[PDB]
């Protein structure tokens, strides 16, 4: 059977990208994580302290505790037929703010603003994101040039 080591099969997952080894850029250290941010997990092999287990690599969780160097986050893990929301502590290098939430936040601010506006105007405005509707009817103008014929080319071997 296999081995139950903590880092089995991570030679590519925890490795560094090509031509990106060396000193960790300081912007990663200079970011602020508060209680309740949605955050992504991406193990970085450069630092070995507080490295998350390989099964949380690429997972997104919620911050619930902030500490000197690390952050505690609640993340869902599918174990057999059930999902457990378990909390793990990850050092700040292996973490990154999720941009999936800021889009929704900006949308909230923007449609709240356009709801506050036009409230006095009384006009109607659409807020829900409708799915891509079918294309409407239109005209395709030929400019006096007729469409050119397309025919299959004859078979002839290359190799």
């Amino acid at each position: 059977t296999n081995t139950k080591g903590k880092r089995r099969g991570t030679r590519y997952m925890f490795s560094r990208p090509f031509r990106k080894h060396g000193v960790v850029p300081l912007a990663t250290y200079m970011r602020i994580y508060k209680k309740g941010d949605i955050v992504d997990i991406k193990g970085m092999g450069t630092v070995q302290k507080g490295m998350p287990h390989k099964c949380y690599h690429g997972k997104t969780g919620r911050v619930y505790n902030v500490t000197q160097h690390a952050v505690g986050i609640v993340v869902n893990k599918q174990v057999k037929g059930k999902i457990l929301a378990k909390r793990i502590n990850v050092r700040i290098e292996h973490i990154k703010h999720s941009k999936s939430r800021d889009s929704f936040l900006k949308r909230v601010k923007e449609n709240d603003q356009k709801k506050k506006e036009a409230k006095e105007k009384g006009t109607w405005v659409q807020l829900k994101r409708q799915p891509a509707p079918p294309r409407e009817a239109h005209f395709v103008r030929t400019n006096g040039k007729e469409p050119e014929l397309l025919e299959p080319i004859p078979y002839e071997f290359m190799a």
Binding site: Q130, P131, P133, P134, R135, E136, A137, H138, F139, V140
Partner: protein
Amino acid sequence: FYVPAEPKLAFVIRIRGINGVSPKVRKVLQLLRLRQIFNGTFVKLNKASINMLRIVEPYIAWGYPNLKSVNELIYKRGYGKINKKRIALTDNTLIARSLGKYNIICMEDLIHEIYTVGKHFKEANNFLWPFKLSSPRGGMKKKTTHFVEGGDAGNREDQINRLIRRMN
């Protein structure tokens, strides 16, 4: 050239049985409310509906229904879902109560709203119980393969009307 607008309404008929269905296809068929062979329903078209139908192409025959097809389907096979019960629509008051708040008050409102995909098409279609169509008189071409390659599955633009004429 004048390209007509892409159709907004489609009719879908399940043409495969219950035995041996992939879980994803089973879930999409449940969502589309095709739990029985030769069941049919109306679907409004968008990106989500296109992809959902593409997932279950081998199990359904779908097309763009005609006005006469909508009329006949509503009048002959049309039953309403009132109080979680399948009630045949034999009077306008049954429609008027279930869809009065949406200004649908009779068969004509129901048919118009379905055919033109109105603002409350979702409510109208959900009130409409899935259609139980008889087996296609005259037979099918080939159930297993796609319509383009001479079968019956997949998308047939307007031949769904020919299919409906014999399946109802």
